[PDB]
RNA sequence: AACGACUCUCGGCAACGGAUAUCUCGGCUCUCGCAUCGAUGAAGAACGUAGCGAAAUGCGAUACUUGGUGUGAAUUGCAGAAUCCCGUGAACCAUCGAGUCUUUGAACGCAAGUUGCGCCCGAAGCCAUGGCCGAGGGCACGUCUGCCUGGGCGUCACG
RNA sequence: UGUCUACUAUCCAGCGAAACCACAGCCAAGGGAACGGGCUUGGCAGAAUCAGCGGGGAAAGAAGACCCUGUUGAGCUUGAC
RNA sequence: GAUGAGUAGGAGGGCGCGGCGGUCGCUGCAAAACCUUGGGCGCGAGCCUGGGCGGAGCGGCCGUCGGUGCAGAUCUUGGUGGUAGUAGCAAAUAUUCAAAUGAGAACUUUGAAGGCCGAAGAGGGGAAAGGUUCCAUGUGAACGGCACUUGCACAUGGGUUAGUCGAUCCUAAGGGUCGGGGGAACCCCGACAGAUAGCGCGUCGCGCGUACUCCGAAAGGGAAUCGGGUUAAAAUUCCU
RNA sequence: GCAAAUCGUUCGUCUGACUUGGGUAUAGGGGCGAAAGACUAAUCGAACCGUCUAGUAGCUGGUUCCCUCCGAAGUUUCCC
RNA sequence: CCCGUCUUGAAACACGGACCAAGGAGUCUGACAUGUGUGCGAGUCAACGGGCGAGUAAACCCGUAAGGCGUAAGGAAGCUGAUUGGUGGGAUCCCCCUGAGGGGUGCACCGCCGACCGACCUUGAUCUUCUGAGAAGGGUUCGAGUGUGAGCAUACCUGUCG
RNA sequence: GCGACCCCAGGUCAGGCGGGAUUACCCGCUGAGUUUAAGCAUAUCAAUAAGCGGAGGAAAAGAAACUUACAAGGAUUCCCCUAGUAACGGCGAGCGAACCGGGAACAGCCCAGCCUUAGAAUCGGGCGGCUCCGUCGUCCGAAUUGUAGUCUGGAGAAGCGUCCUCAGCGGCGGACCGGGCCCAAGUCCCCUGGAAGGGGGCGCCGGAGAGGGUGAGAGCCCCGUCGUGCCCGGACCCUGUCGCACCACGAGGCGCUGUCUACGAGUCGGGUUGUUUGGGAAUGCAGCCCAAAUCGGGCGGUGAAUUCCGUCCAAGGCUAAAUACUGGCGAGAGACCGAUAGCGAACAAGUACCGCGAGGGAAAGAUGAAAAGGACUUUGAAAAGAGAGUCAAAGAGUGCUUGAAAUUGUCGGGAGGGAAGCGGAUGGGGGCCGGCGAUGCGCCCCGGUCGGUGUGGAACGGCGAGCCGGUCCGCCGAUCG
């Protein structure tokens, strides 16, 4: 999503300078010509001059992008998925869900027809959701350093993501004004929001609808998914990861 | 969140485009709140202010203080307020300026414009926060 | 070989200088929309223009503006104004359709280190058809269509 | 060689630069990049300051113009291509 | 249990700077920066903290990114020393006395005296070039390489009057051009390839008619002004 | 340094191939030269200005934090 | 003994450095290569573009005879195109035995020697459309080949080159 | 001599057209060298910079004298791929396209020539009228050395019959583009402060928690922001609907028909020369020489003859879209710079200043919330000082936020016989440090205070229906801790 940056490409050689050579008791540097002004004399052209020319100017078509393989992209946003059920990454990524019933949190359809932010609220206080919404708004505070004029004045903590599986739903603008809180379609999960911060256990808040539609959209371990063509769950190298099990098992301690 | 193409949310933009301002301009962001039994009466929030509005400051150490407006000096985005002074070092009497959003309206200069401008302004209140 | 001066050195304060920190109506980069200069005198250049201004910005002898429309009470550094307020109405306000737009410049009567050197038309006014006076305008080059006036035994026809 | 005059230098009031500067500034021998202000061994060595002086600082002024090197030139010449 | 040198060079683990995605915090009951003969930690890069100053922002941790770390480059820009109150003020003969003015006088003004330029001048004008430096009044600073009450400085105001003086007109070396000839075109030649410009006389007509009615001289050529008087500053220009 | 060529004294010529103002013509591999490679705006054995251009350089100079570990080569062959 | 520097050799009578602040030099990009991390795997790659979508430069979805690289090589070319392992060491495991032991197992890797495909050479029973087919049988020749695939995408360091 | 025509000349004749400017992208011409090749001349740099011209919102290109050799594609342009490939190259250094295939877009057409000859059926200008980007009338011209119709190879002309198609304007609305106006919620209580916009408390809006302003971190003080509603204007294109009108003479379509069936010249092509291209016995272009054809011509990537085959139809013209865009005008955005940075220029910057000229070309941002910009007294010729005053602060006093280092003065401590500094080791004198250094613990009784086995309830748990538990409340007993 970055936007290009770069220096002019005529900065620091708009002048006709040249070098007085040697024998002058001064730097090789090239220097401006003519008289009458403090400019005249002056170094130029150079990384180390006052007005002259960056080392190795920035320009545009640095490659800024990357393509990362579709099939690394589908294993890091279930992995992602998966961590949002495991209530200790998620109080370990810094959400407060002290108060939720259950995770994964599934809720009832109807409110995806909520429309006011007023009602929005008052659902994510009966679900046990409302207390890390409250801690985004108390998080609200200015950007430290040069980031604050560069039109990002604003940094808050990041809330509950809340899935639903109905296009058009009205939740979608009820939740909005809220900080903290985002809204993404079940359809169409972000790993941008699922681990923001390349960091696991995201507090997310799943509709009845979103919920049952996570084993057609990305399949199981026997039959693939009806909207990724092809694709099947990744494996693990360790079928059970409880070492102490294994380790402490009969056949392993005989 | 702002989703019109034509709104800017650029710091840069909206600080030039408000000390740049012409003066008829000047005279929208020179805004006043109208005072509780104004509000109530007319149905109005806001009123640009007026040389001949009597105004009550709610801020600053002038709190409290009430008097009529004798200038409102949009180059300087004050307006002065009569007896709301200070004396210089040589005892002479100058005019505090006052920040007309620091100010509550007690009184309105009414006019023929004046009293068609509130009309307008209760006429959406009415309508688009009452009816919906 | 004290004291004091000098030199060096450490600390407090005071100087010198403008680093650092925090700022920013600027720059840079990406993306998007639009297609609109000029002989109907452009871009550029010059001179002038405000109650108090040199510059910048604006404007053209109607000269930091006229007019229309919108907005609806200022402008402001000072002065002044029975200029203006339930309004044919303030503003160094916004906007544009009416109108003005000096000398130049492709620059066009000829020229130019010259406000130099010509010719033509002519309102108004005025003295008895004429004379003076005169606002204002005209007179470049190439070229197209048409037109007028002409040249050559160029090709003919008739006296 | 002596001497005479003027203007400097010299002293004062006022005014007031620049070149240059690693740190610095007494010597002898020694060794050392074979010619030291610094190192080794000795001579020695006593605040601050004035006018002169050209031994030394291998003094300053300039990335040696001489010479050589470079697969750098340029002016000129011709039986070079 | 053994073991420890290292230029050129390689590699590992760490420190520090500024953003970005997250997360945990601090701050007008005082953030950043900066200062300190305060104290402490780390082999070290560095880090933590007391006090002071300052008056509005800042930091820790994980990941990620970069215009990310200086003693040098006769490095760049800016600032500052020693040198040093030192080198230096010296050509063009020269000043002195009294008084006035002023806070202040070797330097301003008046008077007196003594000298110099000595008519191919240190005098009186003008052409170029400059452009208000001209004149009056006033003046804090700066400037006039000492000084100044001073002024070619600064501030305010004033000042350049033509039928006869010049430009203007004429042509010189030459310059710029029509047509024509060249040229991709910018341009080249320049009256040389051509139905010239028009003029004169009658009152629209006759006669004449050799391709530039152009630019080019404030010293060449050239229609006409002389005394006397007048301003703080103008005159063969104003007045008679 | 008064001065990026001046000052002092001393010298050459001084009716001519004399000196000088203004106007005008010649422009960069070109001009102009009683000829010194002189002169062409303090620039001339090829002016000045901008651009190509951040020209190339086997050559000179510099090349920015800490500890820890390993740790050289000046020899072979080929190469205007 | 003064730092920095070139040097066989610097305290040098070798060069730079009067002093302070700030600025100040292996970077970006294309190609390739080794190594490592990750995904998938005889496949791999959403890359032009399309469908959309945080009212949206992101994310998500799409390869239907698309394309790249790989999946087969040899030959200048006309062309032809892999008969599918033997052996000496060897990890691990199993049995006996409790030896520097003896059997079975024999991956990876290395050595050695055949076979197969192709260039070249050689060979030809038996057929055929006269120039081809191929029973058998080859070679001190040559190949960046075969003998049950290992690649593709992506991240980054280092190195060569523009 | 009078006339017509031809060519030419003059005109301040009537009415029109042209020049110049701009640079990002676009079209034509012209055209280097630095450089690379480790030298260098071909080559490369490069069909590039500089130079000279011409346009537009796009330009240019464009309806095959094509690709190809297949089961064939089908104007142009552009993207991916083809591919760093074929080819070219002191075959060195290097250089390097195209077709197929997948996509974006999509659009086709107009002339010249044989063909009115019972009628130049065409066009311009002057004048006049009307429903005025036009149309009608009239007059004078242009034109037969040919205007308008018909035709363009995909065809077509002519004849025949099938009996298919074809004739306008206006009203309203939508869509499209631009603008204007109104519209959510605290400025409630306490504390700090110069100022609350900070902290604490109590509320509210939210399809609005983008952004900015206001005396410190403001969703609710102000402008805006979200979402409706209302109003005004521009385009005359596209589209929906309504009203009126609605002559098929002619023309076209379809079918058939013996016949007819015209298509661009100093051009194609060839030779040669130069240049250019990946194009190699020669890719294009250009000069000169030669110079065509009509059952023919061009192409088919090795020159030539011969026999076939495939393919297209040059030498005339127009044309939207997909594509480009460091200029202009308007708009949005950013992991960019933060006053030696970033454009040279954050500011009266292409300015001051320099150069005869072409050109060269800087430095320079920040008092405070508010000037509240320091009255007055006293000293001095004055600058100014001293005291006082404003302010939260002059330790913010008009180049004034913060105010580092070099360097300087002063006061205080200390040292010094031709350097000083530095490593190591103590000492003297300073300065600094109470987490610089403790004061508890165990056992007794005096008092005070606070809780105590067995049965009842409350909310749960460990182990896996059932066993095994603790916590809290209450009631008895026990009488200690
Ligand atoms: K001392
Ligand atoms: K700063
Ligand atoms: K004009
Ligand atoms: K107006
Ligand atoms: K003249
Ligand atoms: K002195
Ligand atoms: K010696
Ligand atoms: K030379
Ligand atoms: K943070
Ligand atoms: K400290
Ligand atoms: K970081
Ligand atoms: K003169
Ligand atoms: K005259
Ligand atoms: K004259
Ligand atoms: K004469
Ligand atoms: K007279
Ligand atoms: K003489
Ligand atoms: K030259
Ligand atoms: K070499
Ligand atoms: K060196
Ligand atoms: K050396
Ligand atoms: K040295
Ligand atoms: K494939
Ligand atoms: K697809
Ligand atoms: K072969
Ligand atoms: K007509
Ligand atoms: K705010
Ligand atoms: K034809
Ligand atoms: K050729
Ligand atoms: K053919
Ligand atoms: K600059
Ligand atoms: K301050
Ligand atoms: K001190
Ligand atoms: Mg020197
Ligand atoms: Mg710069
Ligand atoms: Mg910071
Ligand atoms: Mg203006
Ligand atoms: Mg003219
Ligand atoms: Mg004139
Ligand atoms: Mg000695
Ligand atoms: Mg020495
Ligand atoms: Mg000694
Ligand atoms: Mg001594
Ligand atoms: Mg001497
Ligand atoms: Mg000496
Ligand atoms: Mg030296
Ligand atoms: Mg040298
Ligand atoms: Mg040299
Ligand atoms: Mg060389
Ligand atoms: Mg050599
Ligand atoms: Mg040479
Ligand atoms: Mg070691
Ligand atoms: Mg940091
Ligand atoms: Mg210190
Ligand atoms: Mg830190
Ligand atoms: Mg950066
Ligand atoms: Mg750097
Ligand atoms: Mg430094
Ligand atoms: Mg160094
Ligand atoms: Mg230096
Ligand atoms: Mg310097
Ligand atoms: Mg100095
Ligand atoms: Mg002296
Ligand atoms: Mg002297
Ligand atoms: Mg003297
Ligand atoms: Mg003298
Ligand atoms: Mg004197
Ligand atoms: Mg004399
Ligand atoms: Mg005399
Ligand atoms: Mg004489
Ligand atoms: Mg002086
Ligand atoms: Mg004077
Ligand atoms: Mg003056
Ligand atoms: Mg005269
Ligand atoms: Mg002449
Ligand atoms: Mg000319
Ligand atoms: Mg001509
Ligand atoms: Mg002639
Ligand atoms: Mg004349
Ligand atoms: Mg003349
Ligand atoms: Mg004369
Ligand atoms: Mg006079
Ligand atoms: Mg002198
Ligand atoms: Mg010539
Ligand atoms: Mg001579
Ligand atoms: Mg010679
Ligand atoms: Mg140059
Ligand atoms: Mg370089
Ligand atoms: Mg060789
Ligand atoms: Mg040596
Ligand atoms: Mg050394
Ligand atoms: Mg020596
Ligand atoms: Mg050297
Ligand atoms: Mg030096
Ligand atoms: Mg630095
Ligand atoms: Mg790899
Ligand atoms: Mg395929
Ligand atoms: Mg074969
Ligand atoms: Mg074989
Ligand atoms: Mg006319
Ligand atoms: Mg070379
Ligand atoms: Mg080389
Ligand atoms: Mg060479
Ligand atoms: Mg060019
Ligand atoms: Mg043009
Ligand atoms: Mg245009
Ligand atoms: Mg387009
Ligand atoms: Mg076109
Ligand atoms: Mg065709
Ligand atoms: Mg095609
Ligand atoms: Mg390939
Ligand atoms: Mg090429
Ligand atoms: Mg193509
Ligand atoms: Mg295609
Ligand atoms: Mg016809
Ligand atoms: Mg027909
Ligand atoms: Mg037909
Ligand atoms: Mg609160
Ligand atoms: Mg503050
Ligand atoms: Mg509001
Ligand atoms: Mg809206
Ligand atoms: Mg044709
Ligand atoms: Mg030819
Ligand atoms: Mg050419
Ligand atoms: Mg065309
Ligand atoms: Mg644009
Ligand atoms: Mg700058
Ligand atoms: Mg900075
Ligand atoms: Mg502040
Ligand atoms: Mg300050
Ligand atoms: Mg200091």
Redesign the interface.
Known sequence: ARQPYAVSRKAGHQTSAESWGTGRAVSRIPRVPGGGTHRAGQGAFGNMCRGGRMFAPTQTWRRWHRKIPVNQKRYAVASAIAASSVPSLVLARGHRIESVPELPLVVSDSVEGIEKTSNAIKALKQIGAYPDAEKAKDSHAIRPGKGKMRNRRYISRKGPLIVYGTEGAKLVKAFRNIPGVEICHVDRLNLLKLAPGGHLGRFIIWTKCAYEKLDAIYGTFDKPSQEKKGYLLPRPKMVNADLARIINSDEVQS | ?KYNPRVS???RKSRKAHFTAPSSVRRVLMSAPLSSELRAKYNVRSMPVRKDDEVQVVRGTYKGREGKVVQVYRKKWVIHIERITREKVNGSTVNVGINPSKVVVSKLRLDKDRRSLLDRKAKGRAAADKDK
């Open positions: 969140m949310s650029s710091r």
